From a paper:
Ngb is over-expressed in hypoxic conditions and it may be involved in gas/redox sensing, radical scavenging, and/or signal transduction. Notably, hexacoordination in Ngb accounts for a peculiar structural rearrangement and complex kinetics upon ligand binding, which takes place when the distal histidine (His(E7)64), engaged in internal iron hexacoordination, dissociates from the heme. The dissociation of His64 is the rate-limiting step for ligand binding and it triggers a repositioning of the heme which slides further inside a large internal cavity. In this study, we spectroscopically and structurally characterized three Ngb mutants aiming at pinpointing key features: a CD loop mutant with enhanced flexibility (Gly-loop), the F106A mutant and the double Gly-loop/F106A mutant.
Crystals of the Gly-loop mutant tend to dissolve upon exposure to CO in the reduced Fe2+ state. However, by freezing crystals before complete disruption, we managed to determine a structure in which we observed about 40% CO ligation and a concomitant swung out histidine conformation. Moreover electron density appeared for the 49–56 segment that could be successfully built. We propose a sequence of events for ligand binding to neuroglobin, in which after spontaneous rupture of the 6th coordination bond of His64 to the heme iron, exogenous diatomic ligands such as CO can be coordinated by the heme only upon swinging out of His64, having isolated and determined the structure of this intermediate in the Gly-loop mutant where the Tyr44-propionate barrier is absent. The mobilization of the CD-loop-D-helix unit could facilitate the His64 dissociation from the heme iron, unlocking its swing-out displacement, thus leading to the increased CO binding velocities observed by rapid mixing. Removal of the barrier to His64 early swinging out increases the velocity of binding by one order of magnitude, reaching a much faster rate limiting step in the Gly-loop mutant with respect to WT Ngb.
Numbering used by the authors: 0 to 149
Amino acid sequence: HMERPESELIRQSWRVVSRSPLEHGTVLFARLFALEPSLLPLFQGGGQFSSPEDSLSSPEFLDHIRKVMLVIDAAVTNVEDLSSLEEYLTSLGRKHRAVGVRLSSFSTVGESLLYMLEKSLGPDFTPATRTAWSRLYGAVVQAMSRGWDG
Ligand code: HEM
């Protein structure tokens, strides 16, 4: 349950972001690392003390930014009803727990998301657009938090 006018604020703004997902994704992660810098070591080359062993164990950053935005894409596609994605999102959450990402970190992503959108859109980031994106992202996180034994 999210109604057409709000779904449409989301579809439109996402269209602008979708012109350049890596560029905007990089803004999201930069804010993210400013807020939680301890997440950096989870990516290939994000360590101060790591060998080339991480390159295969760990995700590469720009590649993973693509994956993040693809998942957000699916959420947008299902903005009006998100239940067909809960299976997946519960599975994705489990993966993030498995490699040491705290649930609390996904809040920091939310802020970073709103920050990216705000930079991306300026006055077009209307209060209703911000609120709707909180609801949408919160719903995504809700589904994902299922993978944390909770
Ligand atoms: C602090 C935030 C985040 C960190 C540190 C992070 C870190 C990682 C890491 C380390 C992996 C590799 C997982 C593995 O192969 O075991 C990964 C995979 C992934 N992440 Fe994230 N992630 C974050 C947020 C997100 C968010 C918000 C999304 C989507 C909404 C996302 C989507 C993905 C996807 C799709 C994969 C691929 C997993 C697969 O192949 O099944 N991540 N993430």
